[PDB]
Amino acid sequence: KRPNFLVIVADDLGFSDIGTFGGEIATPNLDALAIAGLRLTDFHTASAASPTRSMLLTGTDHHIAGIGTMAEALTPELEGKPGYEGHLNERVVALPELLREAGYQTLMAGKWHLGLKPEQTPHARGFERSFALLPGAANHYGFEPPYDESTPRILKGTPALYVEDERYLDTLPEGFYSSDAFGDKLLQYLKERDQSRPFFAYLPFSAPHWPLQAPREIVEKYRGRYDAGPEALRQERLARLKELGLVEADVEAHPVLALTREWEALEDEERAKSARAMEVYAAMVERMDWNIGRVVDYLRRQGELDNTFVLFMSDNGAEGALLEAFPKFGPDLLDFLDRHYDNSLENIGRANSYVWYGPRWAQAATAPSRLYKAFTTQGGIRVPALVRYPRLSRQGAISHAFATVMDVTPTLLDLAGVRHPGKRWRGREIAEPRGRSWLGWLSGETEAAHDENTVTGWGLFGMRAIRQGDWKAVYLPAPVGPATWQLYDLARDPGEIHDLADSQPGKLAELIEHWKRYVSDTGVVE
Ligand SMILES: [Ca+2]
């Protein structure tokens, strides 16, 4: 029989957060899947949420699929540019659209971030059943601030805007907490399914994305765990990554860069609030894991899990952003939060708190990689991923084989026996995948789905990367980089520390040719 699919996406989860990826956070359900499956150390997304999601569900690049930049970042200049529509566009066909016409039941519960309008919903784009947060974020409990002209832009852009199928919801249920509600709905849809046909189940959490919020009883489990701070944590993560074989023992970690005060420079009250944010974060991840368990355990008891291809991934690097640092997110975010929320120590994590853990906590989870979410360095794009499917040969191991989010759609089509329709679908021109099916690799026929000549690009927020084999060039503009192409050998320098631009000018030049072709193939506009 054709397999089921369960595609689970964490939101801004960091590389070493989960237990089997070197973390101290309780993730038993994921860990059971991970150790019996295949853990990926060289799996890549885009550097931010909607770009990644557009790639996941198409098998092509975000600049083609409609999210050339984030909608919330769109300009009048970028306006009519193809692929910069700000929603999944009609130049692509989505994975669920293809499966659904081939007899799969398409079921989703979670964050969408691929369009706000009726014709852009999961219902519109291939899901027979869906319960979805349409924006990029929202209050986990559905506590909404006043909305008027004076509301910070980052809050105006993140209302708790939910749909079920075609119905825009006017209320949320009592006791609504995002991760629990997604677990509840997806379980509902699975229990309500036609058991005589396969399913494609999509479970995009909004945890552990800001605002950091979680049940108090889970936050309590972490009381005091993070009192030694983000650098002490980074060292624990690095040690554990090397003990587990996820990173080689000789790997040189990128230095931590931030403009904030280091832990030892903070006052006791400042530390206590920052540590509490990280305790809350941990609980978000544990609670997400618990919901995943509810879904997976149900499938297991049904006798369906072993014929379910289970993919878990984060959508981008850990979130190091200081939301107060960007005037576009304002005006006066901190003041608004001071007047509308309660970020007192004892209230952090509750519905009427609103915190984010910042650059030092984030870089603890991306280490040894350079930087974090919204950068084209490895910190922003290399994400934890696991595949559990016992029909595959490559299970029980850790793989450092190059892989991307664009490989997923072709892999699942392949397993489903469903052909990509080529260049036309429903009477319109569509893009063909840029990724490659993982089947030969995971079936043990080949060592990897890519090779030394594979070329992949990235570009978002003025930053660039271009990679061929294990050679990668990066471009970070001022004030966050040198506004010049830097060149790295990822096989020797996973931390992107040693710029080889001057010593290997021919390799850089080759990569710059690839970058131009990437721009041209995908329609990148800066
Ligand atoms: Ca994200």
XYZ file of C-alpha atoms and ligand atoms in Angstrom, residues 10-13 48-50 53 70 111 113 136 209 314-317 373, ligand 1:
19
model
C 8.572 23.503 14.503
C 8.675 27.317 14.260
C 12.145 28.892 15.068
C 13.186 25.741 16.977
C 12.831 32.648 7.549
C 9.369 31.120 8.034
C 7.163 31.902 4.970
C 6.980 26.989 3.979
C 8.130 38.166 3.582
C 0.461 27.834 11.181
C 1.867 31.914 6.701
C 3.297 34.404 10.857
C 8.037 31.197 18.284
C 12.340 23.326 12.062
C 11.594 26.054 9.466
C 14.671 28.195 10.031
C 17.478 28.871 12.563
C 17.363 33.142 11.859
Ca 9.950 30.264 11.728
